[PDB]
Design a binder for this molecule. Sequence first.
Ligand SMILES: [K+]
Ligand SMILES: [K+]
Lengths: 196, 196, 196, 196
Amino acid sequence: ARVVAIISVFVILLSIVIFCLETLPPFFLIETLCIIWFTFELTVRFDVMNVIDIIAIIPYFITSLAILRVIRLVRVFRIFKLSRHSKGLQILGRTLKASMRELGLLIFFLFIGVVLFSSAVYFAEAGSENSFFKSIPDAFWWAVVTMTTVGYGDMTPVGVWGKIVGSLCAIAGVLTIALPVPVIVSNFNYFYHRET
Amino acid sequence: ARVVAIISVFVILLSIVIFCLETLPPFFLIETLCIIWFTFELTVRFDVMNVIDIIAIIPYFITSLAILRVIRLVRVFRIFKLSRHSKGLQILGRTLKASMRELGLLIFFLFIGVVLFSSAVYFAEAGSENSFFKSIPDAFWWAVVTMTTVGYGDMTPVGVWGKIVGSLCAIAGVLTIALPVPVIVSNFNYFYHRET
Amino acid sequence: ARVVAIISVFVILLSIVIFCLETLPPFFLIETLCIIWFTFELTVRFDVMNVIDIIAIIPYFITSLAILRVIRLVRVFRIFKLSRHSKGLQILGRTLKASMRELGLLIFFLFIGVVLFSSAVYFAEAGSENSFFKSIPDAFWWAVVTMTTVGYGDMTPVGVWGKIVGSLCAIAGVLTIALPVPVIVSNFNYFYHRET
Amino acid sequence: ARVVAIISVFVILLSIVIFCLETLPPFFLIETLCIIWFTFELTVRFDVMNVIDIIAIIPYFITSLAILRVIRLVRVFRIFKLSRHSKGLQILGRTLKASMRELGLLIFFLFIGVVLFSSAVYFAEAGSENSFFKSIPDAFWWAVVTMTTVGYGDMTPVGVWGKIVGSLCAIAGVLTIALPVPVIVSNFNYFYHRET
Ligand SMILES: [K+]
Ligand SMILES: [K+]
């Protein structure tokens, strides 16, 4: 039984590897053997895990450019089949389910902050002949990187008022992200301790 | 009653969307219908929420370039009308009110650190023919991004002493920002738990 | 008595402002009045605060290029005279005194991580004709920004092994900085609660 | 006895310094005296510390380009001999041993997030003539810097969908890194308090 789980983990990792290397600038045969093993384990088994197992085989069987791009993207959900064997990943999923409202609150706070600071920086920088931000939508990426402290990169053309707005954005993002996490973290600690 | 709240949330989101897309490189009619609904709900209702409702209509009725830029900026405060319907945003406002002194302490610590490290980096880098920072005021943005860990970008022209100052600035900003947050976070957790 | 404290805070802020604007691309008279008030309060008073008061006047009275640069840099310690009037800054100083060993531990951990990852990235990137890092000392700044999550900037010339080293450096810096802070933070919370 | 420990710490620091300066664009004699002292203390002593002492001398005695690069890299493990004299570093090692499973969980979460977001950004950006990411493997560095909030640098060529993926990556990395650390931190606090 444990050998079968080892084989399944090996197949999952091999599928992930082959997907990454086929995206590099044969592979189809290995993918076919992976999908045969996936459907064999699906049939033997026959929940969120079952749904993930269903999704891991659909893009293989299905095969507009947008539809092809979408199916290739959803093909990556093989990585979530590790939840059957990994116990920490199950804990993470349980924690996300038990802190979905807090996740929504985080997304709402980020949305409010990003729209506010994007409008602020766009209007503060619109008083120059050469404008760094063409529009408020053009500044959402800047606002999200400043609030997440990821960093925009080159901020030289931005003027003094834009820099003040950016400093406020950095501080506010730090605060508004530090607020709702020590609830998701507490749920994760609870679930992780309960499991082990 | 709940349908009216749904309509109000839809109108608020539509106003936000139309404001963002009119800043892109019709809209006035939709904004007029939004402001009519806003004033209708204001009159039916007739606190911080009431003040926010007042501010959401003033820029429409009002209409120097600076004054126009300022009124367009304050027009973004429609997003804060969501506090009536959202409960987490009310919790955030209550937490900010109950941790205003800690917010002030954070701003004071950031100000002290930024002035200190800006002076340090400016003087450490003034001993070269090509100076990366023209003045101490020119380095406040660098100090704020280094202390917030947002990141300045390209730091190549800065010399060895400037790099030492930047390393000290990064460490000190990490410390001085991690200090006063686990008080605002505690207030937010208290208020959020009390509400739910 | 409170009016005198208000005057002292105003003079301190005015000195800070005039120092920043004289570093911009008259001022001496205002600085002279500030130093006269500083020495008047020093004489009336006549501890770390007293030492800070002593340092705030020495650079004025003193006036190699290095010595001049050093005295101008130490002239910035006027900002620390706010400790007499501010209570949070006193708490910060007390917390630093009571968590000096933890500060030293943080500096030691950062030093170990920076030397390790600088050596790693330098050796991983030395196998190319165009080397991004000339030496291990040349990579300390990269290591400190990666470990503090400030960000180096452009990392394109760095090869695959260098990128693996950088990913390890980022993770290790996150961990090694998150470790010794929840002790300094606890000391700050203790002192801040005790004061108020 | 304490003088011998002081001498050992001085020799360790001198070896680290000489290694860094010989990597700059004599040294061998100082390194020889360092290795003689290292083997003298190893013989007098004659555990992880003993293994570290063994590794600190092997590269000196040993002397393909890859093998030479590897031995020079493993030569840096002199810095870990400070564990005998430093007590905080021993605490760090004990904490890592007692939170190895949590470290593995962090690496697993980072791996899942990085593969997911690298695939997402590669597919979102493949619909343009000029593609910012050639392949999914080419985007792992971007995913790791975005998830660690280190920052990639210049993100201008990336399109709107890529920017949405990057925002999701930043938020998810913040969450997935904040989750498993308040366990390693707790172990470190426990061990540090127990030692002192
Ligand atoms: K950053
Ligand atoms: K950061």
